[PDB]
Amino acid sequence: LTLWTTLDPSPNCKIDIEKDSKLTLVLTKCGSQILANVSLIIVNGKFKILNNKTDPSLPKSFNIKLLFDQNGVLLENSNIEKQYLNFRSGDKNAIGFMPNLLAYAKATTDQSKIYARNTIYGNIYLDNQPYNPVVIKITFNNEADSAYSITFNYSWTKDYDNIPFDSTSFTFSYIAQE
Amino acid sequence: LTLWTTLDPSPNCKIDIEKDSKLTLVLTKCGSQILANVSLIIVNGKFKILNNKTDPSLPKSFNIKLLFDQNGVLLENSNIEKQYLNFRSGDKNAIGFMPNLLAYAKATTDQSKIYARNTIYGNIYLDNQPYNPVVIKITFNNEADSAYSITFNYSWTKDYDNIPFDSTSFTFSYIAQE
Amino acid sequence: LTLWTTLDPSPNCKIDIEKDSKLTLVLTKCGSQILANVSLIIVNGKFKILNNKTDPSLPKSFNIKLLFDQNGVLLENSNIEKQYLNFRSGDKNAIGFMPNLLAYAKATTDQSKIYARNTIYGNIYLDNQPYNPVVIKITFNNEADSAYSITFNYSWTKDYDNIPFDSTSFTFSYIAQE
Ligand SMILES: CC(=O)N[C@H]1[C@H]([C@H](O)[C@H](O)CO)O[C@@](O)(C(=O)O)C[C@@H]1O
Ligand SMILES: CC(=O)N[C@H]1[C@H]([C@H](O)[C@H](O)CO)O[C@@](O)(C(=O)O)C[C@@H]1O
Ligand SMILES: CC(=O)N[C@H]1[C@H]([C@H](O)[C@H](O)CO)O[C@@](O)(C(=O)O)C[C@@H]1O
C-alpha cells in the first residue's frame, strides 16, 4: 500500500512563504522496507529562483521536515500539513510507513548524536541540468518534539545565478517501524 | 508482476547498427511505483569500444528510447522492438508499467518544456572502473509521436581511449500510470 | 518476504578482528528483484577510526563478502556467520534472495572476467559528512569456492585523519535467481 501526496504541480509545502512549493512524495510499503520517490518544485518565495550570486543573504540550504506524532500523522511544525499525505485506494494509522526506531534510533542524549545510518545522501539537479547539483540529505528520527521524522535537507555550494528550483526525481528506501 | 527483457547477453537493441547492444531492463510493479533495474552492454557498432580520443567524429552521447503506444507496447521508432519486453510467468496491456501522466506530464507547448521531476540522473561506470563515469539520464513522457516514453540518455565528458561500453547496473523507480 | 540482519548496533561481522563491525542488511523480495538496504558501523579493530594520514600501512579499501552455498546459506569464509541472516516472520532455502546466474554469470575462465552489469557503484559518507566519501562497490557472483556471492567493497582516496567508519545508508536492487 501507498502513502502519497497528489501528483499534480499544486503547492502543498511552506519553505519560505505559505504554499511556495510542491513536494511530490510517494511511499510504497514493500514488506519491511519503504520504497520512496521524491521531487520538489518551488513555485513562489525566495527559493523559487536561486539568486545566491546577486543576493548574498539568501541561504544555500533549507529543510523540509515531516514531523510525525506516534500515530504516523504530521505535526503542525512540519513544512507540510497533515492533510497532504493520504493512502492510495484498493490498488489514521501510518505507523507501517514510519522509520524504524531500532534501525534509526533517536540521539540518546543532548550531547550525543544519531548513527550515520539514519541518513541517506543523494545528488539531484535543478532545471534538468547536470551542472546544477543539489545535495539531498534525508535523515530519520533526528527531530525534537516528534515521535518519528523524515527530514529532507537541500544544500548547494554553487553561487547559483537565477536558477529555478525545479528538481529532478530521487529514489531511496528505509526500514519500516512495523 | 514484472515486465522485462531476457537476462542473457544476446543483443536486443540498435544504437548505431542492428542488434549492436543488449539493454537488460527489469521493471517490477510495487503498487504505485515501478522498481527498475537497467544495464547496457554494447557488442558491435561504433559505440562498442569508445575511441573518442582517436575519433573526434564519434559522439559523446546517445539515446535508447522506449516509445510506447497508449496500450504500453513499443512503437517501431524505439531503439528496441516490441517483442523484447515480456511479462514474467505466474511468479497486450502494460499500462500499469507506464510513467504516470499527472506526475510526468508532456510538454504543454512547442515552446514549453517538461518539469525536471520527469528526469532521473545517475552515474554508471564502463568496464567496471570508477574512473570511467557515464551520466545516465532517464526522462519520462518527453518524446514526440508516442503516448508514453522512457528515454535513457548516456553521455560522457572524458575523451575515452579504447574503453568498452560494458556498463555497471543502475536502480531507479518511477510513479506508475495505473 | 525479507532476509535481514538484526537492526540494533550489536556487531555481526569481522573485517579486521572478531565482531569488529555491524553490517545492517535488509533484503526485500519484490518479485523478480531484491530491494536492498545496507549500512556499516565499525566498532573495533584498525578500521574503527580511519587514521590513513598517520598510519600509511592502513589499507584504503576492504571487502565484506557474503559467500553463499547453493542453498543460499553463508559459507564459513564469509565475513559474517550464517546465523546472522534470518527470515522476517509472517509480516533453510534462500535461493529466492540469490543473485541471478543468467544476469550475473560467473567468470567463464581463469583469464576471463565478469560483465560490468554484475557490479553496482555508489557513494556513501562517513560520520554523516558529505566531505567523507567512500565508494561502495557491490559485485554479484564473482567469488571463488562459492555458489553465489554478494561482495561489498569499500574504498576511499582521501588520507582520512581520525574519521570514524560510521557509514550512511545505501539502497540498491538486483535480479533474483528464482
Ligand atoms: C550528473 C552529474 O554527475 N553531475 C555532476 C557534473 C558531472 O561532471 C557531469 O559529468 C556533467 O555532465 O559535474 C559537477 O561537478 C557539476 O557539473 O557541477 C557535479 C555534478 O554532480
Ligand atoms: C565511483 C565514483 O565515485 N567515481 C568517480 C571518481 C571518484 O573519485 C572515485 O573516488 C574513484 O575511486 O572520480 C571521478 O572524478 C572519476 O574518476 O572520473 C568521477 C567518478 O564519478
Ligand atoms: C554528498 C556529496 O555529493 N559529496 C561530495 C562533495 C560535494 O562537493 C558536496 O556538494 C559537498 O556538500 O564533494 C566531494 O568532492 C567531497 O567533498 O569529498 C565528493 C563527495 O562525494
Residue numbers in the entry:
A (entry chain A), B (entry chain A), C (entry chain A): 187 to 277, 285 to 371
Which sentences from the paper describe this structure?
Species D (HAdV-D) are the most diverse species and cause both gastrointestinal tract infections and epidemic keratoconjunctivitis (EKC). The adenovirus fiber knob protein is known to have a highly conserved trimeric structure. Sialic acid (SA) usage has been proposed as a major mechanism of cell infection for EKC causing HAdV-D. Here, we provide apo state crystal structures for fiber knob proteins of 7 previously undetermined HAdV-D, and provide crystal structures of HAdV-D25, HAdV-D29 and HAdV-D53 knob proteins bound to SA.
To evaluate the potential for these recombinant fiber knob proteins to bind cellular sialic acid residues, crystals of the fiber-knob proteins were also soaked with sialic acid prior to data collection. This resulted in four structures of HAdV-D25, D29, D30 and D53 in complex with sialic acid also shown in [Fig fig1]. The conformation of the bound sialic acid was found to be a mixture of the *a* and ß anomers, freely exchangeable in solution and minimal protein side chain adjustment was required to accommodate either conformation. Pseudotyped viruses comprising an HAdV-C5 core viral vector psedutoyped with the fiber knob proteins of several HAdV-D of interest (D26, D15, D24, D29 and D53) were generated expressing a luciferase transgene under the control of a ubiquitous CMV IE promoter for measuring transduction following cell treatment with and without neuraminidase treatment. Non-significant changes in transduction were observed when cells were transduced with viruses with the fiber-knob proteins of HAdV-D15, D24 and D29 ([Fig fig3]). There was an overall trend in reduction, although in BT-20 cells there was a small, non-significant, increase in transduction of HAdV-D29 fiber-knob protein virus following treatment with neuraminidase.
